[PDB]
């Protein structure tokens, strides 16, 4: 008997997948124990829902990333730092960079998964990254004056 699973199962399964088992198992173990559900016509075209109501939701995050990687994986910025030769006195914690972008160019930053590690503090140019899936390794110049 065809039935749609939920919380996966050793022996057979994985949310969504559809394997079939003897009426018994079904009706007396899976269906009452909320394990899996009937594979009706009903909840059939319905699994289509979450199969695409997530497949096309995930494609959004993937599509707001790669769509800010061809418009922001190529920008390098220029930082208004102050010091003199070697070290500064103001590293540049993420946010800083962001206030030098969210407002210096116009880009809301998520000041953490940006690839910046221990605060900078020294003149020169750098590269970082971002995002969880296809990222966006964006450089950045630390200046003077």
């Amino acid at each position: 008997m065809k039935v749609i699973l939920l919380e996966p199962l050793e022996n057979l399964g994985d949310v969504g997948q559809v394997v079939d088992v003897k009426p018994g198992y079904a009706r007396n173990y899976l269906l009452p124990r909320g394990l899996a559900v009937l594979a009706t016509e009903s909840n059939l075209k319905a699994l289509e829902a979450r199969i695409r109501a997530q497949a096309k939701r995930l494609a959004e995050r993937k599509a707001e990333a790669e769509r800010l990687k061809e418009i922001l994986e190529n920008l390098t910025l220029t930082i208004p730092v102050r010091a003199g030769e070697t070290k500064i006195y103001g590293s540049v914690t993420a946010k800083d960079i962001a206030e030098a972008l969210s407002r210096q160019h116009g880009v809301t930053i998520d000041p953490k998964r940006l690839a910046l590690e221990k605060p900078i503090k020294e003149l020169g140019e750098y590269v970082l990254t971002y995002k969880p899936h296809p990222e966006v390794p964006i450089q950045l110049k630390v200046s003077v004056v």
């Binding site: 009426p23 009706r27 269906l31 009452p32 009937l38 009706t40 009903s42």
Partner: protein, 93 residues
């Protein structure tokens, strides 16, 4: 007794007592030693089923058993309640 879904119930029937060799084989014909009435039952069974918040069971034949677990479905979009298992089952078509 009589299934509650399909409505099956005991039918009556005779049991034939033949003897002899069918003429489809050896031949000579085939005789009948004894008849007599008796009844065939519907293989009904019990089917307890959660639903709403109660239990409610069923006098259904293994034949229309699926149909039971099939109602519990089409009623998920219903307002079945009140301490009425007796009424739950009722409106459960």
């Amino acid at each position: 007794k009589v299934c509650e879904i399909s409505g099956k119930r005991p039918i009556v029937a005779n049991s034939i007592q033949r003897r002899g060799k069918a003429k489809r084989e050896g031949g000579v014909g085939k005789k009948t030693t004894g008849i007599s009435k008796r009844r065939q039952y519907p293989n009904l069974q019990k089917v307890r089923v959660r639903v709403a918040g109660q239990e409610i069971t069923f006098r259904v034949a293994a034949s229309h058993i699926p149909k039971v677990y099939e109602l519990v479905e089409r009623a998920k979009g219903l307002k079945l309640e009140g301490l009425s298992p007796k009424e739950i089952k009722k409106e459960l078509l």
